[PDB]
Every structure is written in structure tokens, then in C-alpha cells.
Amino acid sequence: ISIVEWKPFEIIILLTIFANCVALAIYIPFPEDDSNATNSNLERVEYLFLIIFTVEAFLKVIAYGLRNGWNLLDFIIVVVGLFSAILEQATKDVKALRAFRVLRPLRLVSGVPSLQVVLNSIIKAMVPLLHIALLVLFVIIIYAIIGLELFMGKMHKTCYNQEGIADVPAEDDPSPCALETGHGRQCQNGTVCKPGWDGPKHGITNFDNFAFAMLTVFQCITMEGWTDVLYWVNDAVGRDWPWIYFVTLIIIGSFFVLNLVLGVLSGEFSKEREKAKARGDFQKLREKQQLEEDLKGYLDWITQAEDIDPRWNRFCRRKCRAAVKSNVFYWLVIFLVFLNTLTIASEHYNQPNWLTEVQDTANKALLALFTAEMLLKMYSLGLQAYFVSLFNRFDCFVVCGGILETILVETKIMSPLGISVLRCVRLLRIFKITRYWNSLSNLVASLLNSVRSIASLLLLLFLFIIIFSLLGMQLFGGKFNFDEMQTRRSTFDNFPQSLLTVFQILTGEDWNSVMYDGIMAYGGPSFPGMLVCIYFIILFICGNYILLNVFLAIAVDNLADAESLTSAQKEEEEEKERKKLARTASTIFTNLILFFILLSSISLAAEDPVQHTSFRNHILGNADYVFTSIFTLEIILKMTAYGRNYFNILDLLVVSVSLISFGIQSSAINVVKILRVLRVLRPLRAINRAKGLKHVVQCVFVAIRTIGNIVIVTTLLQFMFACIGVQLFKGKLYTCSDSSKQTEAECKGNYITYKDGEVDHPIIQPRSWENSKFDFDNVLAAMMALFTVSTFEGWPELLYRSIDSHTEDKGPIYNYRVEISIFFIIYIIIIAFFMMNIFVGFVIVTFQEQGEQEYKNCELDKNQRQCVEYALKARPLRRYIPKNQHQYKVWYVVNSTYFEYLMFVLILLNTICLAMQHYGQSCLFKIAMNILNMLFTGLFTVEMILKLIAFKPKGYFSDPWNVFDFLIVIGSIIDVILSETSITFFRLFRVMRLVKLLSRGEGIRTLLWTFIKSFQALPYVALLIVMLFFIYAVIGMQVFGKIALNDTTEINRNNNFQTFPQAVLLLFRCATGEAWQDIMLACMPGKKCAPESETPCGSSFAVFYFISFYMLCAFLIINLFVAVIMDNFDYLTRDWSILGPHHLDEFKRIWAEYDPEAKGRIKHLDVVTLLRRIQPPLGFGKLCPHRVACKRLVSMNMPLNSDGTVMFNATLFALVRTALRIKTEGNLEQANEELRAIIKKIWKRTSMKLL
């Protein structure tokens, strides 16, 4: 029967699996056992769909004898299917076994070759990202433990409305409180508050066990809701030290973790590109452009040659080609394109009559001219040369749709279809002549040439989303139905809704709000109930990983291809054209300031925001008189030395700010109020008087010059999508407070609202016709709504508000249109993913081609320079072999090999014992673990005082690791000493022993040490983000921070501008992108400000501030990331198979034990074991040392030394030159003169090394 396994069976089975997938798509879940007829038919169909697979699996086993992989997966799903069918038929378990129906499409996808190839590539790229998966696992442990020690159950009190126990009556957001003698949020006015409260968010988010605090740390690492946890641990424990946790976790675990991932991925992509460029795949596209380029001019030359004549086109063709390409024709077609985009853009909601008439009349008035232009350009270049151009076909489709829309104009449907927008791609005609437009054509060229691979990757990602949506609706289908009044729309009811929810979780936005619903639906916080968070965690991790692997591989590969194609094709432009002649022609003062200016900056930072009269703003009110005169005196001393450069103008302006703001008088409500803000230019004075700062600033400005093209393209697409969305949601996003009214006229007066859906507590509210927070009435409003969508903040609300829109000036209808989610999906895919990852890839490839473009073409490729420099900087190390007999014994006991395993397990059980402190622990449990902790302290002390007598009291302090362990130990015994009696601080050191255990491992140490040395190598890139934070903190503090701390808005006791640290925290929260739009709304003008300050408070500057800050912060962080990545790029792409510094390090570590001191004196017989202990890659394998290896080692000319006086550098260089780059005899002087040409100075230290 192994003859029907041919094509028909394969395609038949693929069709069966596809039909099974669609059957699962339809299935739809119902709350609590309900079902319609479709579910009563699909359960019948999924018996034939099981018999087919059973028949398939029955023949293969007795035909092929299960170990093929995907065959095994098919077998598991089949056997689970039969077991499920038997159980369902015999029981009248359903949840358990209908889940394998999502494993079924996996077996589907493992039938297509070029999807299996893509998955293999993804899995091969996943392998290097395992150390940076271990370090992310050993941070959510070290910080979970710390959270266990600090916030164990401290967040269980809440206001209770003293007058009876009742049930937590305190606003519609129960928040922790304190006992006054405590340090949290007092309920103040009455309302005494007592323990016995589930938790801040139903008990799912709290530091109680090692499970609820190994999820709270994960949420604060994915940055989606870390401020909400910070506030909950803030107003429950105090506001003094809860930030050193929640900011040191995100500047160590969410940026220095997202940095390594990007670096490794970029390195792997570059390495793969270099490995794939050798086959010559770039040549085919390289030869494709010229073959296409040299066709149009060949054809039109042939075309116009026929027109010159040897039937009466003596006035047609002459004014056909020389009139559509006659300059003015173009430059006026551009004018008409601008007219069309103005016509379509100049529309809003509730337009005037004249605008509606004119923008409707001009449509066809321009369409007729452009349709004529079609033909006028058609018979000029003919049909072949017209249709060959890809961009010509774009305008072809645009005009076709324009003359086509007068059929569906009868019943709107597409409305005035947003096709008139898409014509502004012909406004890039003006862009045509702009700098590097012949890379934008190359951009789309590459993105369309690699379209097959792009589509395969996108299809694999889409299949992943589909599978995790089917499983999502199987798990949480019809279970998000609680008695709570609201009807949360992030459910898993249908397939479109499940897809939208999965897409929302995949982009991170509110991924922790669906997780809480999933946990509360499957029981609650418990052992079996709180296990469904695994679904969301795996979804997030895998989705983000695949998003990176798709949208960054596409960007990096295609953009590097385009850049290389440009730099290799426009290069020959000169060598071909310019040869037109070839045929024919043939510090004290600087300190004295850098101190004063920065101290003035910190003086202007620590002011009093909210108060206009105080002592801090009087000490710092009259502080600036020493500064202002000495700052002005610098100009006076320097002015007469000359008679003007650039930064001196900035100096003049920053000093004239004080020179004028001292006086002004008169109108003391303005002008002083802008020069008060204009004092944020004092720090910028230091940019000129400090070298290196100019270097980094100029680098950033040249980066602006490089990425202006991408920025302009992104903003043009923003304008385009805003224009399409205007004709789609123009005024349809209105709603009333009462859902029973759907008209502004009807939505008036009062109506009854019931508290918490209780019919016995009616409260009168007014009726208000309120527009959405982010509407689409005009182009400008859509430009902000789409920006907020692209920031992945608040976009689900916009999606589920626009879904309910049906008609203009009418109320919403539940799920009126679900196909409108495609607009947001396409916008997120194209702008929020493609055009941002293309930005990042452009920066990465630009920084990678710069630098190493130094062209160190003194031969000596990029391994031997490092090998030679390491050979030069080398010496035998120190071993410290102890004397005095018994000291050698103690050192041997310490320096044993299997005692290290004992020392590692004594830490492994220490962390496990420490990480069991739950809440409400049995009294005996605490003391039982306390004595165990004391025993661990005793045993570790024993180890330290055993190492002291072994390594001598000197070497115990040399290695930082032993010093670090000593510091940890001595801070552990005195904790036991104070246990007889601050305390919270001293319980913490054991996590440092844990992080040492983390540090164990060669790969972890190499990666981390290299990245830290790279970060230290560039300290002038962090003093750009620091400057930005300083300037915007001061600006926002002076402008927007005077408002009252109203707990009902997004400005409260924790989020405000009323102090510099709090302003910095607010800017940090906006930088991480938590609620920046909400803070911008809260900074809108008309908010009542503090009564202590003498509703006019607020400003309209909020939009500019909170948009410019976000964009600039993103740019600066990306610049820092790319700088630190490209400083270590040499390590990132190394091909460890070839010789590397690690081999030399291990060679040195083996060699050092044979020399009591550094010296350089060796023995002659140690070579016998040296040739055996060298690694087979570095040296020789398992061959006998007394062989050709020794023969060639002695054959070469060693330096003229004694039997054993050869130095370490000489033999190391001999080994490295025999391993790689072998040369014939007589080339020793060639190496001698080469090492003095490009290599660094030897300082005449190779006198003996010459021979």
C-alpha cells in the first residue's frame, strides 16, 4: 500500500486539515453548555475529519514501520482524537481534548516546504538567544526573592467606611492604606481601615508567594503596568524607597535585556547575510536593475526613430514625447497633484456649504485632466515602455479606480473612496530629484524582489496567530461572563474577537488586563486556577520573538541590500561618465566653569514648582547673582580677544536671558513667564566647553541627516492614513451617556444610573453628547489618533469605539461592523511595525558600514590583527602555590575541583529555602527556615575562614569574587547578631550569592563583560538622554506643574510635576509609554491649580511637549542602543569555530601553572604535555606528541635563546602562526616589518622576538 502515498494523498490530506481548521474557526463557544445547530453539525463533521486521519495513520504504520517528527505529532493528535470521541460518546473532558485541534494546523503547516524552511531558520536563530534567556530567567528570580523580603503581604489593608464592616467602600478602585503610625495612604477623613482584604487586583498582583511575585516581576519587565504596581507598593509602604526596585528592574531587566536581544539578532542576521552573499544571490538583483534600466531608453529610441519618417504624425509625436517630458509638463503635473491632495485633505466634520460644493466639483475637474494625461503619456512612450514601469501601473490603477468609482457612487459603499489619496505617491516625483531617491526606488525594489520570502514569513506569523486564537477561544470561550456590570470587549467569543484579542496581547498593550480576566474566569488565584497565565506568557514571548525575527530580518536584509546596491551601482556612475574626458583629454578656566554652569543647573533644578513665594525660591531666588556676573565676565574677558562663531551666540543668548529677566518689569504676567522657562539653556552652554560632547551631538545630527528620508516617509504615510480614516469615521464616533438615545437632540436632560448595576440605588445623571477622546473629524485630529495608535497606547479603546460606529451624528451599535478592524490592523502592520523596524535597521546598517569603512587594507584580515595584538599583550599569569606544607594542604582542599559542586549546591538549596516565605506561614515554618538560614551562614563562614588560611590573607582580597563573597558573608553574620534584637536591608545579600551562581558559565561571562566594557567605553552617549531628561523636567515643571493633586485624574500624589524627582519619574513613565496621552489630557488648560498658589492653570503646550519628548527620547535611546551594539559588533559576529581570544585565554590559563612567577623562563620537557593539552582546534588533536607535530614545532626557527629561556610571547606567536597563515621560510623579516607598520607601537620590546 506504499504506492498511494503519492501526490493525490498529500493534497487530499492538506485539504482535509484546512477544512478542519475552518470548521474549528466556525465552531464558536457558548456560555455554560448552550449550542446552536451549527455546533450540532460541526461535531458530526469532526467524525469524518477523524476517520480520514485514522485511515491515513493506519496505512503509514504498516507501510513505513512514527519517528519522522511531524508524523509523530500527527499520531498524537489522532490518538487523542479517538480517545476524545470515545469519551464524548460514552459520557454525554471536552475542554481537555478539543485543545489538540490547534496542534492539528501545526501538522498542516508542516507540509509546505517553504514554510518549514522559514521555521527552521527561525529556530536556528533562536539558539544564540539562550544565554539571554537564562539571564532573563535569573533576574525574575533575584528580584522576585527581593520582593518577597520587602513586600511580603504589606498590601492587604484598605479603607472600609467606619460605620460597619460593609465591603471595602472606598471609590471604584480599592487601594491600600495604612495605620497612620505606618507610612502609606491614610484614609484621612474617618474611614478607619483594617486588614482582611483580598488584594490590589483581586489578589493576582501582590508579593505573597514565589508565584505571585514571579508574575508581578514579569509584568514590570514587560513594562505593561509597572506604574500601577509602583503606586500600590508606594501608598502601602511609603514613598521613600520603592523606586530603587521598580526603576533598577527596568534599567537592568527591560532595556539591558532588549539591548542584548537586538544585538545578537542583528549580529546573526549580518553573519547570515555574509554567508549568503558568497553564492551571488545579490548579483541576480544587481543584474536585474541594469537589464531593466537599459530597456526603456532602448525602446523609446526605437519608438521615436519610427516617428521621424523616411502616416501623418509630423505634428503628433514631436509634441508627444517632447511635450509630456518637456519639464513644464512635469512641474505642473506636480502642481495638480498638490491641488488634488489639498482638495481631498480640506474636509472635516460639519463642513460649510461652499467647501462641500467646491471639493465635490473639483474631483472630476482634476480626474478628467489626469485621465487625459494618461493617454498623452501613453502614445508618447508607447505601450511597452508605459506598462513596464511599476510606478506607472500605480497611477494606472489610481486612474482606473477614479473612472470606476462612478458606479458605486450610486449607493456610497466606498464613499468618496480614499484612492485620491494614494495618488500622492506621484508627489514623490518631486522626491525623485531629492538626495538618495535612488535608494527609495531600491527600497521598494528589494521589498518586492524578496516578496516571496516576505510573504512566507508573514504567513508563518499569521498561522501562529491563528493557532493561538483558536486555542484562546477554546480555553476562554464564553467564560468572560461575570456578574460585573461592564461588558469588556477583550473576549474570546467569536473568531474575529479572538483574533483581535490575540493581536492586542501580542503588541503588549493591556496584555496584563486579559490575563487577569483569564485567571478570574478559570476559578481564581489558586494552584490549578492560576496556571492559565502560562498561555498568555508563552503567547507574549513567542509572538514578540517572531515579530522581531520577521519585521527586523526583512528590514535589515532588504535595507542592507538596497544600501549595498546603491553604493556598488552609483559608484560606477562616476567611473563611466567622468571618463568622458578620458577619451578626449588623453584647562583651568574650563574647569572654572564646567563646575559653575552645572552647579547653576542643579540650582535651577531644585526649585519650588508650585509656590511663587518661599525660601527655596529665595535662597535660589537670589542665588543667581554670583553665577550671572561670572558668566557674563567670561564674555568680557573673551570678547576683546576677537571681534562671531556659533556657540558664542548661544552663550550670549543664555546670559542675556538673565540680563533681561532681571528687569523687564511692567507686564509681570508674561515675557517673564517665558524667560523663566528659557533658563533651560544653561546646560547647553556646557556642550561647547566640553570636548566629546560636540562629537556626540554632531553624530546625532548626522544621524538626523541620514534618517530624515524615513521620517518624512513615515509622516507622509501618517497624513495618507489620516485622510483615508477621515472619510471613514467622520463624526460617527459620537455617543451619549445614556445608551438608549442615539441623537444629540435626544441626548438631553437627565437619566437614571444605577450604582454597580444595582436596581435599588438609582442616581440621577445629566445626559451629555460626548465625542470620543481620539476622534477622526478632521485630518489633524486623525494625525494625533493614529500617532497614539502607533504608540500602542489606548488603541483597543479606539478600535472598539470605531467598530460600533454606523452613521454620522448617531449613537453606537454593539458590533455593528467588525470588518473595520482591518484598517487598524493594516495601519499597525505597515506603520507601527514596518516603518519603525526599517528605521532601526537603517540605523544599524549605517553604523555597521561606518566605522570599519576605515579600509585597513594592509592585508591582515579581521582575525590576525587581534591574534597578533593578543600575542604581544601576553605574559605568564600568577598561580600563588603556597609554601609551609599544611598551607598547601588547605589550598588543595580549597582549590579542589569537585568541592566547587558542593559550594554551588550549598547556594542552590540556600535560594530554594529562602524563596518559600509565603503569607500566613505557620509559626513553626518561620523558625524552621530561620535555623536553616543560620546553619547556611555558619557553613559559608566556615568556607571563608578555610579559604583565608589557604590563599593567605592577601590573595583573599585580590580577586573581587572572593572579596564580594567576603563582603556578603560579613553582612550575613551580623544579621544573625541583630536577630538577637535596617533589618530589611540586611536580609537581602543572599541574592548576590545567587547572582554569582548566575555569573557561573563561560557564555554568560563573555557576553556580560563585553557589553559592560562597551557601555563604559561610551559614557558621552548617556549624557544626551540625561540632558534631555533634565531639560524637559525643568520645562514641564515650570509650565505644566501647578495643578492640584486630584486623585480622580492622571495627576496625583505620585504622578505630578511638583518636584524635580517626581517630574523625572513622570518623564520616565512617559518614556516607557504607560499613559502619556492621559497625562497630556490632564495637562490641557482649564484645570484648577493648587489653592496654596496665588481655573486658569494649565497650558496648550501639552501636545508639543508630550509628542516631542516621546519622539526625542525614542531617538536618543535607539542611538545609545545602536552605539553600544556596534561597539561590540566585532565580538557579536565572530564564528567561534575559527581561532578566537578564548582559545588564547585557555592556553594562557594552562600555561601559567608551569611558571612560579611571570618571568618568562620555562622548561624544555613541558612542550611534551603542552602539545597534548592544547585544544584540537587551537593546536593538535589526539595525535601522539612525538610525531610530525613536534617535528614541525622544532623545524621552524625559534628565537636564539637557551634550552628553556624562550619567552611566552614567542611561543604563543609561533603557535598562532602555525595554526593560521603559514608562510614559507625567509618571510620572518616580512612579519618583522609588518608588525611595525599597522600594528601598534612595540616600544622596542620585541628585540629578542625578532628571531
Ligand SMILES: CC(C)CCC[C@@H](C)[C@H]1CC[C@H]2[C@@H]3CC=C4C[C@@H](O)CC[C@]4(C)[C@H]3CC[C@]12C
Ligand atoms: C496547545 C497545545 C500545547 C496542545 C493542547 C494542550 C493543552 C492546552 C491541553 C492538553 C491537556 C489538557 C488538560 C487535560 C485535563 C484536564 C482536566 C480537566 O478537569 C480540566 C482541563 C484539563 C486540565 C486540560 C486543560 C487543557 C490541556 C492542558
Ligand SMILES: CC(C)CCC[C@@H](C)[C@H]1CC[C@H]2[C@@H]3CC=C4C[C@@H](O)CC[C@]4(C)[C@H]3CC[C@]12C
Ligand atoms: C499555550 C500552549 C502552546 C502551551 C501552554 C499550555 C496551556 C494552555 C495549558 C497548560 C496547563 C493547563 C492548565 C492545567 C490545569 C488546569 C486546572 C483545571 O481546573 C482547569 C484547566 C487548567 C487551568 C489548564 C488550562 C490550560 C493550561 C494552562
Ligand SMILES: *[C@@H]1O[C@H](CO)[C@@H](O)[C@H](O)[C@H]1NC(C)=O
Ligand atoms: C477634584 O477633587 C474633588 C474631590 O475629590 C472632586 O470633587 C473634583 O471632581 C475633582 N476635580 C477634578 C477636575 O478632578
Ligand SMILES: [Ca+2]
Ligand atoms: Ca501600555
